[PDB]
Amino acid sequence: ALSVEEKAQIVNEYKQAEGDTGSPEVQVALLSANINKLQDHFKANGKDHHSRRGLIRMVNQRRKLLDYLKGKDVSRYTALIGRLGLRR
RNA sequence: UAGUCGCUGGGUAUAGACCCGAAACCGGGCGAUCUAUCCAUGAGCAGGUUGAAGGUUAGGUAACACUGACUGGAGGACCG
Ligand SMILES: [Mg+2]
Ligand SMILES: [Mg+2]
Ligand SMILES: [Mg+2]
Ligand SMILES: [Mg+2]
Ligand SMILES: [Mg+2]
Ligand SMILES: [Mg+2]
Numbered sequence: 001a002l003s004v005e006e007k008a009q010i011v012n013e014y015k016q017a018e019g020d021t022g023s024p025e026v027q028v029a030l031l032s033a034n035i036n037k038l039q040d041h042f043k044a045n046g047k048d049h050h051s052r053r054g055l056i057r058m059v060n061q062r063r064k065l066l067d068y069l070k071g072k073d074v075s076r077y078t079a080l081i082g083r084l085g086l087r088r
Numbered sequence: 089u090a091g092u093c094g095c096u097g098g099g100u101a102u103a104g105a106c107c108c109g110a111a112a113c114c115g116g117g118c119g120a121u122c123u124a125u126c127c128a129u130g131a132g133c134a135g136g137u138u139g140a141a142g143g144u145u146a147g148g149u150a151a152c153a154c155u156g157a158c159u160g161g162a163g164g165a166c167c168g
């Protein structure tokens with residue numbers, strides 16, 4: 001549901017090596033933006049299970065990436081959790 | 089082959105007709121200061137319990153859900 005401009009400004013805001021789209025932080029930010037964006041769509045369309053499957057897949061991907069990042073570096077983990085405003 | 093009109097008595101008819109005695113029917117009125125409903129305007133209900141919805145907060149959820157604590161004061165509720 002994201003746009004080209006939205007993704008570009010997200011990666012610009014969260015890039016860590018001036019051209020890295022694969023670092024955990026960028027992917028986590030993109031997934032969080034998409035999850036937050038799809039909420040209002042699912043507010044109106046409660047009977048759309050087929051898309052909610054993809055939403056759950058994105059949630060699982062974000063969870064796994066956060067777990068890996070926490071396992072690797074605690075400081076970057078805490079910083080990312082702080083900026084994204086999510087519990088854990 | 090004598091009837092008529094009085095008077096006095098015994099009967100009869102129509103009248104309450106020897107006297108007392110119903111439950112009832114019909115007509116015009118009087119009553120909702122009792123009581124039954126209703127309408128307007130007032131006032132009365134000591135004292136003590138229980139504790140719904142809701143709210144706040146801390147968790148928790150992708151989000152809605154869902155838990156605890158505090159609060160709150162419902163009811164043809166409870167004891168009197
Ligand atoms: Mg004579
Ligand atoms: Mg005579
Ligand atoms: Mg006589
Ligand atoms: Mg007589
Ligand atoms: Mg008589
Ligand atoms: Mg008698």
Ligand SMILES: [Mg+2]
Nearest residue numbers: 114115116117
């Ligand atoms: Mg009468």
Ligand SMILES: [Mg+2]
Nearest residue numbers: 118119120122
């Ligand atoms: Mg009377």
Ligand SMILES: [Mg+2]
Nearest residue numbers: 120121122123
């Ligand atoms: Mg009266």
Ligand SMILES: [Mg+2]
Nearest residue numbers: 123124125126
């Ligand atoms: Mg009565």
Ligand SMILES: [Mg+2]
Nearest residue numbers: 128129130131
């Ligand atoms: Mg009154």
Ligand SMILES: [Mg+2]
Nearest residue numbers: 133134135136
């Ligand atoms: Mg009282």
Ligand SMILES: [Mg+2]
Nearest residue numbers: 162163164165
């Ligand atoms: Mg009541």
Ligand SMILES: [Mg+2]
Nearest residue numbers: 162163164165
């Ligand atoms: Mg009531």
Ligand SMILES: [Mg+2]
Nearest residue numbers: 163164165166
């Ligand atoms: Mg009653």
Ligand SMILES: [Mg+2]
Nearest residue numbers: 163164165166
């Ligand atoms: Mg009662």
Ligand SMILES: [Mg+2]
Nearest residue numbers: 165166167168
């Ligand atoms: Mg009682």
Ligand SMILES: [Mg+2]
Nearest residue numbers: 134135167168
């Ligand atoms: Mg008593």
